[PDB]
Amino acid sequence: MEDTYIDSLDPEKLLQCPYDKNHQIRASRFPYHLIKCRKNHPDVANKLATCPFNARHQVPRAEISHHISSCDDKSSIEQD
Ligand SMILES: [Zn+2]
Ligand SMILES: [Zn+2]
């Protein structure tokens, strides 16, 4: 790792951020951005839970409880 032949001949690729598409962070710095960026997004920081009524309904684990009561008869319309 201190050799005379450096790896990655690419100018360091930019990885897209799952938290926000406006974030393009270099591969080596991406893991760090992955850590900090979720802390700025509690919705994803608390992870997503799968609705037992519908697999498309992935909600923050803090809101899953509220979503269950709001998805009793299903058809929970959120931003749709
Ligand atoms: Zn980000
Ligand atoms: Zn649901």
mmCIF file of N, CA and C in Angstrom, residues 16-43:
data_model
loop_
_atom_site.group_PDB
_atom_site.id
_atom_site.type_symbol
_atom_site.label_atom_id
_atom_site.label_comp_id
_atom_site.label_asym_id
_atom_site.label_seq_id
_atom_site.Cartn_x
_atom_site.Cartn_y
_atom_site.Cartn_z
ATOM 1 N N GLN A 16 -23.068 7.758 -6.630
ATOM 2 C CA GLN A 16 -24.299 8.488 -6.373
ATOM 3 C C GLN A 16 -24.803 8.183 -4.966
ATOM 4 N N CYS A 17 -25.356 9.192 -4.315
ATOM 5 C CA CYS A 17 -25.826 9.061 -2.949
ATOM 6 C C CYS A 17 -27.284 8.601 -2.917
ATOM 7 N N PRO A 18 -27.570 7.514 -2.180
ATOM 8 C CA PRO A 18 -28.934 6.989 -2.032
ATOM 9 C C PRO A 18 -29.826 7.920 -1.216
ATOM 10 N N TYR A 19 -29.201 8.807 -0.452
ATOM 11 C CA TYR A 19 -29.941 9.729 0.399
ATOM 12 C C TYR A 19 -30.395 10.944 -0.397
ATOM 13 N N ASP A 20 -29.558 11.372 -1.330
ATOM 14 C CA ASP A 20 -29.872 12.515 -2.168
ATOM 15 C C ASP A 20 -29.085 12.430 -3.465
ATOM 16 N N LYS A 21 -29.782 12.584 -4.577
ATOM 17 C CA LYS A 21 -29.192 12.392 -5.894
ATOM 18 C C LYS A 21 -28.264 13.544 -6.270
ATOM 19 N N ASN A 22 -28.290 14.613 -5.484
ATOM 20 C CA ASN A 22 -27.438 15.767 -5.749
ATOM 21 C C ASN A 22 -26.067 15.588 -5.117
ATOM 22 N N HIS A 23 -25.835 14.432 -4.512
ATOM 23 C CA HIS A 23 -24.544 14.148 -3.907
ATOM 24 C C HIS A 23 -23.782 13.142 -4.758
ATOM 25 N N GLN A 24 -22.657 13.572 -5.299
ATOM 26 C CA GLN A 24 -21.764 12.688 -6.027
ATOM 27 C C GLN A 24 -20.396 12.700 -5.366
ATOM 28 N N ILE A 25 -20.117 11.668 -4.587
ATOM 29 C CA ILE A 25 -18.909 11.624 -3.775
ATOM 30 C C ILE A 25 -17.951 10.561 -4.298
ATOM 31 N N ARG A 26 -16.664 10.893 -4.291
ATOM 32 C CA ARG A 26 -15.618 9.995 -4.768
ATOM 33 C C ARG A 26 -15.640 8.666 -4.021
ATOM 34 N N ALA A 27 -15.333 7.583 -4.729
ATOM 35 C CA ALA A 27 -15.477 6.226 -4.194
ATOM 36 C C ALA A 27 -14.852 6.066 -2.809
ATOM 37 N N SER A 28 -13.609 6.509 -2.653
ATOM 38 C CA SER A 28 -12.882 6.330 -1.399
ATOM 39 C C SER A 28 -13.513 7.117 -0.246
ATOM 40 N N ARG A 29 -14.236 8.180 -0.570
ATOM 41 C CA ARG A 29 -14.840 9.026 0.452
ATOM 42 C C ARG A 29 -16.328 8.729 0.592
ATOM 43 N N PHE A 30 -16.822 7.820 -0.240
ATOM 44 C CA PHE A 30 -18.241 7.490 -0.262
ATOM 45 C C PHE A 30 -18.704 6.848 1.048
ATOM 46 N N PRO A 31 -17.995 5.817 1.574
ATOM 47 C CA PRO A 31 -18.364 5.179 2.842
ATOM 48 C C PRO A 31 -18.546 6.192 3.971
ATOM 49 N N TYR A 32 -17.665 7.187 4.014
ATOM 50 C CA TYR A 32 -17.743 8.229 5.028
ATOM 51 C C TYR A 32 -18.986 9.089 4.817
ATOM 52 N N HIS A 33 -19.284 9.391 3.560
ATOM 53 C CA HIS A 33 -20.468 10.172 3.229
ATOM 54 C C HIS A 33 -21.719 9.362 3.538
ATOM 55 N N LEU A 34 -21.609 8.052 3.392
ATOM 56 C CA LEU A 34 -22.716 7.149 3.668
ATOM 57 C C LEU A 34 -23.094 7.214 5.145
ATOM 58 N N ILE A 35 -22.081 7.385 5.982
ATOM 59 C CA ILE A 35 -22.260 7.445 7.423
ATOM 60 C C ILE A 35 -22.868 8.780 7.854
ATOM 61 N N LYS A 36 -22.267 9.872 7.408
ATOM 62 C CA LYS A 36 -22.696 11.199 7.836
ATOM 63 C C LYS A 36 -24.032 11.597 7.220
ATOM 64 N N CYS A 37 -24.238 11.237 5.962
ATOM 65 C CA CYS A 37 -25.406 11.698 5.223
ATOM 66 C C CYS A 37 -26.695 11.092 5.779
ATOM 67 N N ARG A 38 -26.623 9.872 6.310
ATOM 68 C CA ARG A 38 -27.806 9.247 6.899
ATOM 69 C C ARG A 38 -28.151 9.903 8.228
ATOM 70 N N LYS A 39 -27.145 10.442 8.903
ATOM 71 C CA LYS A 39 -27.359 11.131 10.172
ATOM 72 C C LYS A 39 -28.119 12.434 9.951
ATOM 73 N N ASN A 40 -28.034 12.961 8.735
ATOM 74 C CA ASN A 40 -28.769 14.166 8.367
ATOM 75 C C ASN A 40 -30.150 13.808 7.838
ATOM 76 N N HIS A 41 -30.443 12.518 7.800
ATOM 77 C CA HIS A 41 -31.718 12.034 7.292
ATOM 78 C C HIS A 41 -32.258 10.934 8.203
ATOM 79 N N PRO A 42 -32.876 11.325 9.335
ATOM 80 C CA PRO A 42 -33.370 10.384 10.354
ATOM 81 C C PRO A 42 -34.356 9.360 9.796
ATOM 82 N N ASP A 43 -35.000 9.715 8.694
ATOM 83 C CA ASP A 43 -35.969 8.839 8.046
ATOM 84 C C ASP A 43 -35.304 7.557 7.563
#
